[PDB]
Amino acid sequence: YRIXSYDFXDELAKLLRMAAG
Amino acid sequence: YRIXSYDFXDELAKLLRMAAG
Amino acid sequence: YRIXSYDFXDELAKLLRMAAG
Amino acid sequence: YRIXSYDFXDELAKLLRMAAG
């Protein structure tokens, strides 16, 4: 799930993990 | 990834799919 | 994450939910 | 999606990225 070359999907996954611990 | 009994993770996955086709 | 006309990413997400539900 | 002290969900997401990168 990318906006151009930016992996939005991956970055969203990182936020889910960081928020959840 | 749930807010209480609501599966936010799952619903987010559905949005990623619906938006992307 | 597709394998041809198959949304593998989506199926994996549904599997995670099914197994954890 | 954890298996004990292991974030399986996170590792799966990273694998999808690695294989598709």
Report d(CA A14, CA D11) in Å as an integer: 11
- Please report residues of A whose CB lies closer than 8 A to that of B9: 16
Angle separating helix axes D8-20 and C8-20, nearest 10 degrees: 170
Report d(CA B3, CA B16) in Å as an integer: 19
Picking from B5, B8, B9 by the largest number of C CB atoms within 10 A of its own CB, the best residue to mutate is B9
Query: What resolution in angstrom units was achieved for this structure?
Result: 1.5
- Cβ of D20 within 8 Å of Cβ of C12? The answer is no
Q: B1 vs A3, A8, B12, B16, D14, CA distance in Å?
A: 23, 18, 10, 15, 17
Report d(CA C3, CA D8) in Å as an integer: 22
Residue C7 distance to chain B (closest CA, Å) = 9
Experimental method: X-ray
Neighbours of chain D (3+ CB pairs under 8 A): A, C
